[PDB]
Swiss-Prot record, chain A:
One of its GO terms (molecular function) is structural constituent of cytoskeleton. One of its GO terms (cellular component) is pericentriolar material. The modification Phosphoserine is found at residue 131. GO terms for biological process: cytoplasmic microtubule organization; meiotic spindle organization; microtubule cytoskeleton organization; microtubule nucleation; mitotic cell cycle; mitotic sister chromatid segregation; mitotic spindle organization. Belongs to the tubulin family. It comes from Homo sapiens (Human). This is Tubulin gamma-1 chain. PANTHER family: TUBULIN (PTHR11588). It comes from the Eukaryota. The keyword Cell membrane does not apply.
């Protein structure tokens, strides 16, 4: 059975990501914006129960618990195509509508006020899950609502499922884009703190990489938080298709991530997708070969992590696994491995056996795929530390500069100082250093 | 088998109904860390006439 | 295999029961004549 | 012969609930509001004699007795579409019209004053019934008249048909909401007392649970009092379905409750229905799955009994029977059982044999079903004790405060003391404790 | 499993055979009387 994931949507960015994810999932499964399967959606081969619950035999409701400290995101969800997809009893919106003021602490306190409702929503979504593994919270770490509410949701998932794994997709603030959330580094630090203490694995999603990909590959000059969240949701959908469309391989999230998470502390994951295409370029189904796919994967425009140019550390991939979905020729896979080796397209750890695992997944039959073959890569790469190290450096710079702390000072957790943010930044720095160490043979003795 | 079919989207399909779990032999004890521990399980496929001329018992045995 | 063995056992049990019923009614008739 | 059910209608709220119950039963049996068999009721598989009695060779009259201490409700019944359903000799109206003053004891004293009429009604319905199983009293526990008069009617139903089984659908008052009827907790205690002593199985209908079902399942934002009464009537219908819809098993009320009631004291039942829809919400035919049905029936938000979420006590069903009609996939039933077990949506009694009995019957052509596939569950569930224990605690809190006792002191039953309220609270507490025991293996020794 | 189903089938087939022989002899006796 699939490993079901409960989705927690926090703040503006998290709610936008959830809305776009639900739209994409509905389109792939032929589910109407109300959660009902379209008459053309006759391929009952998709696993809705991993991410969605059935409200009726026809109506699919996401196994999602929506927790936010700002009413704007809840209103945007209710104005989204997925407004009727989710169970309204599983949506928690802060009554004060005042948001978190871009303060992680305010968002966390609002989540704490809605803790009971949020955990009831999460439990309701789990009961709609045939084999709920745990909860996955999708939020941004840069805002006030999405950061604080995301940490609160993670805490409540940890409280309710303390023996179950809790993975988070935590969007770290863009370091190349000027964040409108001046307190974004403090919020990001608090979210990284919660991922360190209450999550078992944190996949670092650098909003800088999302903006860079939108600019260079999607030709989006200014990716909005909603647009960045929708890009993240599209990437998550493509990577999760093998969980939602069961096949011979990658039928569960844990099977996909097992190769990616070598140690409990080295749990910072990077993501990759190939072939990378802009949303506008869907028209031309390029007969991309596995060699061409692998060549495109090496392009930074397709990497979901914005690693800084570290000049001192030769950050490297310890291992890379590409899960490819669609029409794939094994001879093309062989040529891809050959071309990667000749071009040295992937560096592996030198201290143990590592390879490119290949998972084959079916495409949604109801959603026309513009690509004959698509693929998600999960890889352990020391450059993923650069995203976490960059988030930590920004957090430390904001706390040391008391930047935007007056908005945080309204909440008791951040009223006097941002020391929790600085300690979180230090923990994330240690995580980055461990991720860089994981490229080295001495990772065996880490901890 | 019932739990796996109930959890499978294809488990209730008539094609899944042609699957049968049979035992090749009954081990006294499950050997720990043996990769072949579950080799006693066989999935058999029934072929009716005339398909059993083409889908031979040898073919079904190799599939098993 | 297993489903085919199940079907053979079920059919054989049904046939034996039907034959036993026919025998029972035959014996009752031979006891009545 | 069918197992006939005598309906006891007590007070304004109880009489409204009884009238709506008789209307629903008539619609299911294809009986017109005038007592004429509808032309659409061609499916002669329904037991009309379960909910209606023959008054003469041609007229079928609902076995309903309208009892009130205030003339308004009795006059409204005689002015209702069910005026010809009830035997006019089975309608008791207090000449004083003053009601019970929201006092349970006053309602009980009025029932004692109207005892003769009520027992005459019960005897008339029994003599018109070829194989009368017993009487079902429909009333509200929150008012003054409907609770006390309902208990009086239950006592008289036990007295008149003492060798016949008497199952009741007793709507208990919400104990977590502040009732404007300050004596409601005493009334709730009296109703639970009467259900414990004179009923063999009591399905507790919490108006809070009715409102919750209307909100979450029927999408009714503000359930009206009429909607609460219709939910109570639906609960009574679901609890009496095995008496009203004959099949291979459970063809009589005593047979139906026999499987549900292990001990005479452990007679506090909770109910659940799925899909629950408000009469107004017929528009959206929800494709309810067996998994969705079982989950909503086991869900307190859709269950016609408002049990608190106790996290510490594993409240359980003593027995549950789900009669499912319509297209059912065996794989969907299997997935439903799997999901229920994984989510532990239903706890069953550990101390005795219990199962879901299934009888296959055709549907009434006269009753429109809002669901392509529907199912009723009748269950004895220990979570009903949480309603009964809360009602008992509220009763004790009111009696210790003498709250609203001045209205009861006008009636002879409460003129000198309020001992009847305290005895009702004690009976409801014992019923709660016995119902909780029925979730445990030690239920064999419950009440020892 | 498979051998146990085969054994049950074999016993049921023996019973069916004996029933058919007894029926055959019964019919021949009823045809001779």
């Amino acid at each position: 059975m699939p490993r079901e994931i409960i989705t927690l949507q926090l703040g503006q960015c998290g709610n936008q990501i959830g809305f776009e994810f639900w739209k994409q999932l509905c389109a792939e499964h032929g589910i109407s914006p109300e959660g009902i399967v379209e008459e053309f959606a006759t391929e009952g081969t998709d696993r809705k129960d991993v991410f969605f619950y059935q409200a009726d035999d026809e109506h699919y409701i996401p196994r999602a618990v929506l927790l936010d400290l700002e009413p704007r995101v809840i209103h945007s969800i209710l104005n989204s195509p997925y407004a009727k997809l989710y169970n309204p009893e599983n949506i928690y919106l802060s009554e004060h509508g005042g948001g978190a003021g871009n303060n992680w602490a305010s968002g966390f306190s609002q989540g704490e006020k809605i803790h009971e409702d949020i955990f009831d929503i999460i439990d309701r979504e789990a009961d709609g899950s045939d084999s709920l593994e745990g909860f996955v919270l999708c939020h941004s770490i840069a805002g006030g609502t999405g950061s604080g509410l995301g940490s609160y949701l993670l805490e409540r998932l940890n409280d309710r499922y303390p023996k179950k794994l809790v993975q988070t997709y935590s969007v770290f603030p863009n370091q190349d884009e000027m964040s409108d959330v001046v307190v974004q580094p403090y919020n990001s630090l608090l979210t990284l703190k919660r991922l360190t203490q209450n999550a078992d694995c944190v996949v670092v999603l650098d909003n800088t990489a999302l903006n860079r990909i939108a600019t260079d590959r999607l030709h989006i000059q200014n990716p909005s938080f909603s647009q960045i969240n929708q890009l993240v949701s599209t990437i998550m959908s493509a990577s999760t298709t093998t969980l939602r469309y069961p096949g011979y391989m990658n039928n569960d999230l844990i099977g996909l991530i097992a190769s990616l998470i070598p140690t409990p502390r080295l749990h910072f994951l990077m993501t990759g997708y190939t072939p990378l295409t802009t949303d506008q370029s869907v028209a031309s189904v390029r007969k991309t070969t596995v060699l061409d796919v692998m060549r495109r994967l090496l392009q930074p425009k397709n990497v979901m992590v914005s690693t800084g140019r570290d000049r001192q550390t030769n950050h490297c991939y310890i291992a890379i696994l590409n899960i490819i979905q669609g029409e794939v020729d094994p001879t093309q896979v062989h040529k891809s491995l050959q071309r990667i080796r000749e071009r040295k397209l992937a560096n592996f750890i030198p201290w143990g056996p590592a390879s490119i695992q290949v998972a084959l997944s079916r495409k949604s039959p109801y959603l026309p795929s513009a690509h004959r073959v698509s693929g998600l890569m999960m890889a352990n790469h020391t450059s993923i530390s650069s995203l976490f190290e960059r988030t930590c450096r920004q957090y430390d710079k904001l706390r040391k500069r008391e930047a935007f702390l007056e908005q945080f000072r309204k909440e008791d957790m951040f009223k006097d100082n941002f020391d929790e943010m600085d300690t979180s930044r230090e923990i994330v720095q240690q995580l980055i250093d461990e991720y860089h160490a994981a490229t080295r043979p001495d990772y065996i003795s880490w901890g | 088998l019932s739990k796996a079919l109930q959890c499978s989207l294809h488990g209730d399909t008539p094609h899944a109904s042609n699957l049968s779990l049979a035992l090749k032999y009954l081990p006294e004890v499950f050997a720990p860390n043996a990769p072949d521990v579950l080799s006693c399980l066989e999935l058999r496929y029934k072929v009716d006439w005339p398909l059993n001329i083409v889908i031979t018992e040898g073919c079904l045995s190799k599939y098993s | 295999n297993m489903k085919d063995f199940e079907n053979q056992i079920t059919e054989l049990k049904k046939e034996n029961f039907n034959l036993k019923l026919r025998i029972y009614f035959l014996e009752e008739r031979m006891q009545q004549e």
